């Protein structure tokens, strides 16, 4: 019973360059062969880095401190393919266009400790929004669901 | 046997 | 082609209609078969930022560029969050 | 590229974009469609510098790098009088309240 989202063990090397084109510290996350996310060394903003990965491995990318979602070549997941004529493959990591609400939640979260969320004078519903922190595990479940609907 | 990704130590992260 | 958004302190903000539709609240109001909308509870220091967000969203949605951060200063964040929630964007 | 602007007079703020290669006069035409005042009845300013009709926006100091969607550049606007002088006057936005204690470094 293997997850839909997982790397395949191709053993076929693929040279990749993670390029952080965001203002965040990026955490690369590798989905292992059982679909479990594994962290890899982070990238400061504006820096890039050579990676030895493999064909059909799966990667996603997050803000290292907050796990806010990031995009890679404009999508959620990145899969190395075989290198054509020595040329490495680029993973260009960017900010998505967050909604104004989610962006405000990021800023409030960065300024307020969770024990104090409910000591802010805002509508009651926003407490649960603030508490609904980004989470890799919930993202994978949502992406799996979305993919199955395409079938 | 399984082969996971790795970062070469001598890779000058640019 | 344009809509006029009015803040609580009387500042008038004229934005392109398509940009204003970034707000789900404004889109539902104007979705039927020059237009003026009054937000007596949103102050000008918040409503100006909301309009900048409309611009930012339309510019960078479906863009391949590098996307810059939408900046929010700490002292406006709570009020901007209330506004975003009220406006659904 | 595009420059993203706020054209402000009194308590009125227009959000619009224009090409760096477009002229001040072309920008007055945009304003004309919105505020019904023709270009020989408008003055546009960058800070307190009156902008000449024939110059491009880039030539006036507006660049895509600084006039961005999320942080547009301000263009001051003043209007006509056939026998008096209307000074440039932009009313400031309101001031935010004090940061809450729970939002300050603790």
Numbering used by the authors:
A (entry chain V): 59 to 209
B (entry chain H): 527 to 540
C (entry chain C): 17 to 49, 57 to 112
D (entry chain B): 1 to 106
Recite the paper's sentences.
Recent discoveries have established that mutations in EPAS1, the gene encoding hypoxia-inducible factor (HIF)-2α transcription factor, are causative of familial and sporadic instances of polycythemia, as well as various neuroendocrine tumors. EPAS1 mutations have been shown, regardless of associated phenotype, to result in an increase in HIF-2α stability, by disrupting negative regulation via prolyl hydroxylase domain containing enzyme (PHD) and/or von Hippel-Lindau protein (pVHL) affinity to HIF-2α2,10. pVHL acts as the substrate-conferring component of an E3 ubiquitin ligase (pVHL/elongin BC/Cullin-2) and its interaction with HIF-2α is required for the rapid polyubiquitylation and proteasomal degradation of HIF-2α under normoxic conditions. The interaction of pVHL with HIF-2α requires the hydroxylation of one of two conserved proline residues within the oxygen dependent degradation (ODD) domain of HIF-2α11. The hydroxylation of proline is catalyzed by PHDs and requires iron, ascorbate, α-ketoglutarate (αKG), and molecular oxygen as co-factors and co-substrates, thus allowing PHDs to function as oxygen-sensors.
Clear electron density was observed for residues 527–540 of the hydroxylated HIF-2α peptide. The HIF-2α peptide binds to pVHL as an extended strand with N-terminal (residues 527–534) and C-terminal (residues 539–540) pVHL contact sites. The HIF-2α Hyp531 hydroxyl is coordinated by two H-bonds to the sidechain of pVHL S111 and H115, and a third H-bond is formed between the Hyp531 carbonyl oxygen atom and the sidechain of pVHL Y98. The carbonyl oxygen of HIF-2α E527 hydrogen bonds to the side chain of both pVHL N67 and pVHL R69. Furthermore, two hydrogen bonds are formed between the mainchain amide nitrogen and carbonyl oxygen atoms of HIF-2α Y532 and pVHL H110. F540 serves as a C-terminal anchor, contacting pVHL G106, that re-establishes contact between pVHL and HIF-2α. The insertion of Gly537, seen in HIF-2α, results in an increased sinusoidal nature of the HIF-2α peptide but that only results in local conformational changes.
